[PDB]
Design a protein around this ligand. Structure first.
Ligand SMILES: CN[C@H]1C[C@@H](N)[C@H](O)[C@@H](O[C@@H]2O[C@H](CO)[C@H](O)[C@@H]3O[C@]4(O[C@H]23)O[C@H]([C@@H](N)CO)[C@H](O)[C@H](O)[C@H]4O)[C@@H]1O
Length: 325
């Protein structure tokens, strides 16, 4: 009975943003959900941090990921559902779907559908990197991640809507971001106004950047906490969050991986590329700067590098995506 008022308390974007990771709010709902699926209920069940969707982890138990109506929940749910269908036998360490359901019927109100998956072992990439001064082990781990990403890119695109060879979702997103990126970066204030004034002429056409490229399985949100590793064993133990997946260009994967998980470290980027035998071209840095601007997210939000005071976006491209010094 509590669920009716509790779920009715979310009716706007701001109202959903304030309660998406409210543990006191979601804990009883998540326990009832697990009971509804016939799954054992963990004694501890906690909201592990800032998630776009409401997420709770059981201490032994599984991961519950709920999807709202506001924060692109429906689209993200469709994407992750299709991705879990496509990843059924992928040679990549991903979680297994333990169940799915809806909290309430869903005719006049939002049904609040949810997925339940297995828990990945290891530590996040973010933790492992923030807790080591052993750069050699980190680079070896990055090469292993390069191998894993090379295999992930080649998972066959057997989906129905987003993960098909002929899907247009990724180019359409890229054109939309090509339109909005310069004003976005003016509002965000990561770079100098001169570079932003040169940007609109510097950036290429989407059709030109994507010409002749083959589609890959592109995880578009490879930040530091969607990747689970065992640093001591040089093992990638998990890759999660398929709410932003595309049949897209392999280079797009690198943006969030490098600017967020790698913190912009060009040496770690080089190790990752070495692991995948991803050969660098002359325009590689400029292409990846273009993909940096065409990304859906604010990828600079986590880059511990001051990019203000930058003219000649070519220099910015060489700085962010160039080879190691
Ligand atoms: C086709 N694009 C959408 C695809 C959805 N699967 C995303 O969930 C949605 O993104 C989310 O949108 C909601 C609003 O509907 C919030 O904006 C969330 O906040 C965002 O987008 C988040 O979180 C992102 C990441 N931090 C998510 O891990 C970036 O920070 C973005 O700049 C930031 O707006 C994208 O826009």
């Amino acid at each position: 009975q509590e669920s009716l008022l509790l779920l009715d308390r979310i009716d706007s974007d701001d109202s959903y943003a304030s309660l998406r990771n409210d543990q006191e709010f979601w804990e009883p709902l998540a326990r009832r959900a697990l009971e509804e699926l016939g799954l054992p209920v963990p004694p501890v069940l906690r909201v592990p941090g800032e998630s776009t969707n409401p997420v709770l982890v059981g201490e032994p138990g599984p991961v519950i990921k709920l999807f709202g109506e506001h924060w692109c929940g429906p689209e993200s749910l469709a994407s992750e559902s299709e991705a879990y269908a496509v990843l059924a036998d992928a040679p990549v360490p991903v979680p297994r779907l333990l169940g799915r359901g809806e909290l309430r019927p869903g005719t006049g109100a939002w049904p609040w559908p949810y997925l339940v998956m297995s828990r990945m072992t290891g530590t996040t990439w973010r933790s492992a990197m923030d807790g080591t001064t052993d750069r050699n082990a980190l680079l070896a781990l990055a090469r292993e991640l390069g191998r894993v990403l090379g295999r992930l890119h080649r998972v066959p695109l057997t989906g129905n809507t987003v993960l098909t060879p002929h899907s247009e979702v990724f180019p359409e997103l890229l054109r939309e971001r090509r339109a909005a990126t310069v004003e976005d970066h003016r509002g965000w204030g990561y770079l100098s106004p001169r570079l932003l004034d040169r940007l609109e002429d510097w950036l290429p056409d989407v059709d030109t950047l994507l010409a002749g490229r083959e589609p890959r399985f592109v995880h578009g949100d490879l930040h530091g906490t969607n990747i689970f590793v065992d640093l001591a064993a040089t093992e990638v133990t998990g890759i999660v969050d398929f709410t932003d997946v595309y049949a897209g260009d392999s280079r797009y994967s690198l943006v969030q991986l490098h600017l967020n998980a790698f913190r912009g470290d060009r040496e770690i980027l080089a190790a990752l590329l070495d692991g995948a035998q991803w050969k660098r071209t002359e325009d590689f840095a400029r292409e990846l700067l273009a993909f940096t601007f065409l990304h859906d997210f604010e990828v600079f939000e986590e880059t511990p590098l001051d990019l203000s005071g930058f003219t000649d976006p070519e220099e910015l491209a060489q700085f962010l995506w160039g080879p190691p010094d």
